[PDB]
From a paper:
IMPDH catalyzes the NAD+-dependent conversion of inosine 5’-monophosphate (IMP) to xanthosine 5’-monophosphate (XMP), the first of the two step biosynthesis of guanosine 5’-monophosphate (GMP). Inosine 5’-monophosphate dehydrogenase (IMPDH) lies at a key intersection of the purine biosynthesis pathway and represents an extremely attractive target since it controls flux of the guanine nucleotide pool. We have overcome this major limitation by designing a variant that lacks the non-catalytic CBS subdomain (MtbIMPDH2ΔCBS), greatly improving solubility without impacting enzyme catalytic properties. Here we present the first crystal structures of MtbIMPDH2ΔCBS, including the apoenzyme, the E•XMP•NAD+ complex, and complexes with IMP and three inhibitors, MAD1, P41, and Q67.
Thus the conformational dynamics of the active site flap may contribute to the differences in inhibitor affinities among IMPDHs from different sources. Interactions with the hypoxanthine moiety of IMP, E458, and AB-subsite are especially important for high affinity and selectivity.
Author numbering: 27 to 127, 253 to 431, 452 to 528
Amino acid sequence: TDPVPTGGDDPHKVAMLGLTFDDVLLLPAASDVVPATADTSSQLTKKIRLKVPLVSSAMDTVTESRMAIAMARAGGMGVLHRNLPVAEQAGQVEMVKRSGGLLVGAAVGVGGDAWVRAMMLVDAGVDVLVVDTAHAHNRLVLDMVGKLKSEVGDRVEVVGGNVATRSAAAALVDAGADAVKVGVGPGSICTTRVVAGVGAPQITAILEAVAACRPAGVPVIADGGLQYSGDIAKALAAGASTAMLGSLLAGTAEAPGELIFVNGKQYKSYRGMGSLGAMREDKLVPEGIEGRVPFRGPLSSVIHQLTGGLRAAMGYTGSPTIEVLQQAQFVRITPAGLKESHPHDVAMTVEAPNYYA
Ligand SMILES: [K+]
Ligand SMILES: [K+]
């Protein structure tokens, strides 16, 4: 436990120190890898390996069929959002399936209606069902995962989330999950940690979930909080097998929504699925906000920047594969270390394709 005395007589009350992406850097190591020779393939689930270890979020401002098609063509996968009627979601799965036999996932909730939705998605040819919940360590979520796996698990892979602890990941593994999705609160548009006061910083959440999942051979999906290509490398080094992205993809041409023009600039709508506008869950109050992000152009170019940065990280850490990157070491840093990591003491005059102010 956290050794430092911070009050009371119970040393387990404050149980650990949580780190997130900006708290760590990957240490370079001996290398015979250059970005060109790195292999970025990685398991999405026990049975499915992607060429690029990225998936798009199941949000109504990120992933519909156009995004799912573009993600699969880029070597990743999209998870179709579930904020729409069951027949429309199933229709979108079909749209993706008839664009080349591309991989696709789709989100479902828990309960009878979610069950009907799942069954329809499976009939439509979905490859991955994602049981998409705020708190997967609730007994009802574990049941849903276990039952889908029992009924359709031969035909479809079943992902469960979200979790932020070792015990929750362990419960999902025991329920038969084919992958575990980690992230309680880190999302750019999420307010769970603020309105409920609940969560775990994302690097520690990954390390803890992986401590349960890795020995069981179950891939971890790092969901939320990623803003730069280097964050993907950190998530994967912490032990995740793939990263799920919302904000980084919401600004692309393929994300749903029309372009927003404000003050000579271009934006796209991006909102939490727990935001008032989205709910319109078991929630009594919202756990997200509604906002906008800058327009970033074609998905393909964004993914090229992200995989290029990941490949650089693999070259620096001497990792020929994602499986080796998962063994890399971190150094913890201070606020000055973070300031030093970004550009500092200079005015940027030109935008970089992989770095914005
Ligand atoms: K947040
Ligand atoms: K720097």
